[PDB]
Write a protein that binds this ligand. Structure first.
Ligand SMILES: [Zn+2]
Lengths: 133, 133
């Protein structure tokens, strides 16, 4: 009886640069932020509607820093979670906002089955994110 | 103004086996199912409260089948989307039912930053999924 998503987690390579992206550029509100010292990890918990986004990452300055492997994008993406789409009122306007922040967003396309406007953009590690009406 | 998650997409190696897992064992409602050879092969859209899960994969019998790479799980998971957690009223019971279906569920543990029960299980391609109170 799986009622609702509780949270979606993601991995990032540079915790600082990604914090700046998710919190300061994309504007997500921070619920909590915790250092997990014997994980060589930080856990950053963001609010997105009624679910949480958990961002896991290390700072480049950490003494035990090891960069995670890069995401597989070509020729084929791997099995597992592929991309995350956010619901917005105005894809065109949110698209412009992103672009104003210096984030590149691909051209507006239409959902294949609903016709709703949508547009892809990428987090610093190339994670495909989507704006979707 | 990223209001909510619209959908989360994932890739599976064996479309029939993953359709069985998600739709028949986990009981997700099918919203749509569409086949566009090559463009996106099979795209299976599932309801999970207010968010859709978009499952992408291809059937082993398809004449142009190419298995996607395996999810990287060891020693370090890759950058990108990591795992997905679902809200359940009763983790203990939900875990019971899953095991009864023949899905292996790891021991019940407690959330570190709340003390709420949770448990991991895995999809046929090793995607970590989580039950959470
Ligand atoms: Zn999508």
């Amino acid at each position: 009886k799986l009622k609702a998503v509780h949270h979606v987690a993601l991995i990032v390579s540079d915790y600082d640069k990604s914090y700046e992206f998710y919190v300061n550029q994309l504007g997500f509100e921070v619920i909590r932020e915790n250092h997990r010292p014997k994980r060589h990890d930080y856990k950053l918990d963001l609010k997105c509607g009624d679910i949480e986004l958990e961002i896991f990452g290390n700072k480049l300055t950490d003494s035990n820093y090891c960069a995670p492997p890069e995401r597989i994008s070509w020729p084929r993406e791997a099995c597992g979670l592929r991309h995350l789409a956010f619901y917005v009122e105005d894809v065109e306007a949110s698209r412009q906002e992103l672009i104003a922040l210096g984030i590149r967003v691909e051209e507006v396309r239409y959902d294949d089955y609903t016709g709703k406007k949508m547009a892809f953009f990428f987090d610093p590690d190339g994670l495909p994110l989507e704006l979707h009406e």
